Amino acid sequence: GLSSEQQRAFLAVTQTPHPAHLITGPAGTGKTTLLYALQEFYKGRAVTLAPTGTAALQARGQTVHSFFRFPARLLRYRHPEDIRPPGPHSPLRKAIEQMEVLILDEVGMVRVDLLEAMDWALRKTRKRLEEPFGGVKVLLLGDTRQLEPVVPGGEEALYIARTWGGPFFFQAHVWEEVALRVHRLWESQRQREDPLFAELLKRLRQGDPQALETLNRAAVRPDGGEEPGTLILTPRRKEADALNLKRLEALPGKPLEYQAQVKGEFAETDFPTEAALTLKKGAQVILLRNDPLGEYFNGDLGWVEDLEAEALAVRLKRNGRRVVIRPFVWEKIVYTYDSEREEIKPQVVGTFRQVPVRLAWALTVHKAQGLTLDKVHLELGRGLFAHGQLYVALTRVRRLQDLSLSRPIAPTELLWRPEVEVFETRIQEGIWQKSH
Amino acid sequence: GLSSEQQRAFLAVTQTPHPAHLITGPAGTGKTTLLYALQEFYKGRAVTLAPTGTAALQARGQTVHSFFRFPARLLRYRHPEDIRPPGPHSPLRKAIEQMEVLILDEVGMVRVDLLEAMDWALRKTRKRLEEPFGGVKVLLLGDTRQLEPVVPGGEEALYIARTWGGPFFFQAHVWEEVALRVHRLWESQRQREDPLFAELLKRLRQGDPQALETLNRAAVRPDGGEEPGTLILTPRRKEADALNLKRLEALPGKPLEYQAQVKGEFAETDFPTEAALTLKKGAQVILLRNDPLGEYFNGDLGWVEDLEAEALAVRLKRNGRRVVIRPFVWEKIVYTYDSEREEIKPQVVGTFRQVPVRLAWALTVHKAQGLTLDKVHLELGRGLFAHGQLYVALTRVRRLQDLSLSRPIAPTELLWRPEVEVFETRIQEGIWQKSH
DNA sequence: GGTTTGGTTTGGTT
Ligand SMILES: Nc1ncnc2c1ncn2[C@@H]1O[C@H](COP(=O)(O)OP(=O)(O)O)[C@@H](O)[C@H]1O
Ligand SMILES: Nc1ncnc2c1ncn2[C@@H]1O[C@H](COP(=O)(O)OP(=O)(O)O)[C@@H](O)[C@H]1O
Ligand code: ALF
Ligand code: ALF
Ligand SMILES: [K+]
Ligand SMILES: [Mg+2]
Ligand SMILES: [Mg+2]
Structure with a gap:
């Protein structure tokens, strides 16, 4: 159609x-x-x-x-x-x-x-x-x-x-x-049943400060994140970590810590996931690596079913199948720029070994781009840093009712x-x- | 020891x-x-x-x-x-x-x-x-x-x-x-090897009029700023800009212009660096922001090596390392006082995005406080405006022959x-x- | 009628 x-x-x-x-x-x-x-x-x-x-x-x-x-x-x-x-x-x-x-x-x-x-x-x-x-x-x-x-x-x-x-x-x-x-x-297909909301998103796309002021008085509800069926979006992985901890501690299961092995030069800011990753049964997670056998891919959402040493089970949302997750290695690459030569060269300086899992009640705006979400709560945290970031966050839902913000956004924060x-x-x- | x-x-x-x-x-x-x-x-x-x-x-x-x-x-x-x-x-x-x-x-x-x-x-x-x-x-x-x-x-x-x-x-x-x-x-240590200059500085510290006259007779040499190995100190940023522009135009490299992006209320007198920043390879510069990765800091001196669209490479004086500089954002804060609440509140009214660099052949006196410099020329410009400004400018060098002034200083200029x-x-x- | 202070974040993997 x-x-x-x-x-x-x-x-x-x-x-x-x-x-x-x-x-x-x-x-x-x-x-x-x-x-x-x-x-x-x-x-x-x-x-x-x-x-x-x-x-x-x-x-x-x-x-x-x-x-x-x-x-x-x-x-x-x-x-x-x-x-x-x-x-x-x-x-x-x-x-x-x-x-x-x-x-x-x-x-x-x-x-x-x-x-x-x-x-x-x-x-x-x-x-x-x-x-x-x-x-x-x-x-x-x-x-x-x-x-x-x-x-x-x-x-x-x-x-x-x-x-x-x-x-x-x-x-x-x-x-x-x-x-x-x-x-x-x-023509807006995602917000086709809320033409007023679609037009507000259209003006926000053009950087309209009147649209922004209207967005603030309509969508600022700091408790929007604590509602059911709500995905929290955040600019940084570290902020998603803090938000995901609260929902993890409220689960009745016994927790299991997955300790990463880090070698050489690898900065904690560069970690794809937590070095001490705690998980519980039933946790919402997102997978970070492709399965070498093809059962799961990077970006697969799912839920933890079993937690064991160096291995866990995840039930995928995509097909309702059960996949077993084992640790992967990540390389940290640094670029040197030799002086006598006009050239740049990459070199591996460290490794990170950990299960390719991240808790997924809160995700970065980057992981949400492309999705149609039922309900979104944007946690501004320490602020917006990428061009298009705010626009992506706000356009994931069909109706204005489905959107909430942690705090009002100023026009000076918008990047172009x-x-x-x-x-x-x-x-x-x-x-x-x-x-x- | x-x-x-x-x-x-x-x-x-x-x-x-x-x-x-x-x-x-x-x-x-x-x-x-x-x-x-x-x-x-x-x-x-x-x-x-x-x-x-x-x-x-x-x-x-x-x-x-x-x-x-x-x-x-x-x-x-x-x-x-x-x-x-x-x-x-x-x-x-x-x-x-x-x-x-x-x-x-x-x-x-x-x-x-x-x-x-x-x-x-x-x-x-x-x-x-x-x-x-x-x-x-x-x-x-x-x-x-x-x-x-x-x-x-x-x-x-x-x-x-x-x-x-x-x-x-x-x-x-x-x-x-x-x-x-x-x-x-x-005991002076910086001027240990020039005891009469240390005695002159001490008398200047006490506002002695005869010391100021002795300084004007010895140190006033308008062409002092053109002599090799000389850092020029000026009271204002815009005065330093003009002095830096002269030295830059003498470098043979092809110029490159970094154009700041300004939004909202900003005004040019508050710009941390020029809105139209011109650079050349070999230009002496000072960095204005700390690297989020920790390779360079606010205050680092260096020289330009590479100039590209939104990125430059600077060779640091501090450690001889090459760092890549990208644009940073600065905010403008105004404080509004509100009716019958005896309180003020801050507000961001504008932003300025620019490469965190200033030309550094001429610097403000504020940026020199704490340094020992080999040779200094004080360009008075429109005059002294801060308490301690003249004293800091005069006390950076080890010997009187290392100091020159653009014009004599009158006693009515000394602030207290x-x-x-x-x-x-x-x-x-x-x-x-x-x-x- | 001037001067100083502040983070690079996020994605890709055989
Ligand atoms: N012609 C259409 N009729 C009905 N629904 C549509 C149509 N096109 C897209 N949609 C729905 O609108 C939502 C967003 O569409 P999508 O293709 O994801 O947009 P884009 O790729 O431009 O963001 C999806 O839920 C999709 O099923
Ligand atoms: N005891 C000392 N012996 C030799 N040189 C010294 C001694 N104290 C300081 N200096 C040198 O004298 C100059 C000024 O010292 P510094 O500690 O920067 O002074 P201040 O912080 O008081 O302005 C510097 O070059 C420093 O190396
Ligand atoms: F352009 Al979209 F999800 F908003 F693909
Ligand atoms: F007191 Al100084 F350099 F003169 F720190
Ligand atoms: K110790
Ligand atoms: Mg799409
Ligand atoms: Mg000191």
Whole structure:
């Protein structure tokens, strides 16, 4: 039951020889739902990828990293150590050579280096080094007014600025070779039954301070988090930890502590999960790693059923199956920048071994992007720090009734990237063409 | 090793249990050098703080603000919204509870609200409301004839006046509960090898008119700032900007401009650095914010190595390390007084986002307090405005030949605070105890 | 009619 604008985007995308399209629009316009119809249309022919585990599951695909086997680190431009082509008789080479279209959801969260590595990997594997993405038609979907890519500090941030001039997908050099045809969606599907709330979100997207003041007097209820069926969103992992502790201590089960093993240089701020992870039976959790056997993936929500030494059972929300979780290793990578040479080099400096589990009554705004949630409580904590973060938090629910805030938000807290503004204005013509 | 007067003050402070000491004396008597011996003596047990970034680095500690996590605004007396004890499991709580000695350098620049907030924060965290500083032994070092605390206009100035009677650290109500034992240093160490210049500085300290005339005859040389290896000191940031612009335009590198983003009420006189910051490779700079990763600090001097869109690399003077600088956000706080509540309230009215860098061939006198410099040129500009400003500028170097002035100084320019005079007189007795 | 003080957070894993 697609809408007039969705069916229009579908026809414009599926029924043209042009290899590079972008379907963009505000949160909840039905971009991912249009992606399902694209999956039904081509459907060996397509490969659906997303930047995050949560967005990957929402779109019924897998992460860009796990498909291409990219390392969890900076992907230097067309570097052979970072972008390694698959084996001569491997299933990955077979899928890449047989590929016809590639559907990339939540493209706003795809960092420039990741998009460039997808281009080069398809070119090297397909031996079509002259044409963008190896001749694969790319169907990109997302919203640059939602969360910007994650850029850590140090030499990695400097390399991105020097190579592309910024981290956004639209800053990739491939857009000099091919043009991006932009198809836009405007009608709110997620809040289609609350048109007043939809219009308030539309004004908040444009940074309207009157909208913000109205949001405050309508949604500020500090006790909204303690209500049933409510997911708490927070900017930082550490704040979700404190909120998840309260709900953990209220469970009647015996608790079991999972102690991590940390080696070399690994800072506690960098831990994917708690070093002393306490869990109880019945706890809401989210999984952080893909199962090597394929039973669970990064982003899978579920509930603890059994707690044992170095092993626990989780009942998945996605399919109601029972999966057993064992410890995984995480590498900490640091970038050195040799002085005599013009080059940057990665090096592993420490490891973290722990069960890939995190309590999931409270989650970061990053883990929520793409989801339609029944009820959300935003805990501001020490404040908003990423562009698009507040917008993502507020647009997850269908009705204004389903949303609550821990405290009022000031207009000075709203972040805006000028690169996004110039992009959003140039694509109003319908084409994104890069300069140089 | 220490001089005999430094050794007497070292023993006086370390062999008595008395919890509050002040080591004071003229510029360059070796207060901070004695502080180093105190760090060696105490030394898991001591935390070293200072009000400014440059003074913190010289003392090998950190700012008071960064340690206690105080906001960069007026700290209302024992106000819960301004003075927030750390969380139950925070590393800062562990540090405060384990702390035995707090060493506070450049205490003369510590504003009364800052000192009081330290006292209250220590009482609250350690849960000893009845002991000054929660039972921590405090060792203060500084000089009240050097720069007075910074007090911007408006309601913030009126609040300090009403609450404490003025801005100085010695006007803190904590001194009504514990006596401050005073230890004096007299021998110049910085100017040890130039005894006539040390004698001139001493007479300038006492406002001697004949000393000022002797200084004007020897030191006035307008072209002194162009001589190699010279740091220029100016009273105002905008005066330093103009002097920095001249030296920068002589570097051969290609310029790069960092454009600040300003939103809401901000005005240019409050900008921490230029809105249109021009940089070149090789430019001498000072960093204005602490790295969240800990590689660099507010006050760190260095030189530009790389210049990219939103990122630069600076080579630190302090350790020869290369650090990557990204934009930071600053807030503007105004205090509104409300009808018939005798209370003020803070509010964020604007933000300024910019790379935390300033050109550093010319610096403000405030940024020089605590340093020993090889060669100084004081550009008077529009004139002296703060108590102690001229004295700090003149006492940075070891020898008279190392100092030059842009123009002669008239006696009507010398500033004096009566609050300082009554304090300097009472501490001749060896004790300071606030009455009433 | 001026000067000082403050965190880089979040995602990807064969
Ligand atoms: N044409 C449609 N008719 C009815 N419901 C829709 C339609 N398109 C999307 N939805 C619903 O709206 C919600 C948000 O859609 P989604 O595709 O997740 O939006 P986006 O990807 O743009 O955020 C989902 O619950 C989805 O089922
Ligand atoms: N006892 C000493 N012997 C030799 N040099 C000293 C001694 N005390 C201080 N200095 C040097 O004299 C200069 C000023 O000392 P410093 O401790 O910074 O003074 P203050 O903190 O009193 O302004 C510094 O270069 C310091 O190394
Ligand atoms: F744009 Al969405 F969930 F995919 F708001
Ligand atoms: F008193 Al100083 F450098 F700390 F002159
Ligand atoms: K010790
Ligand atoms: Mg979606
Ligand atoms: Mg000193």
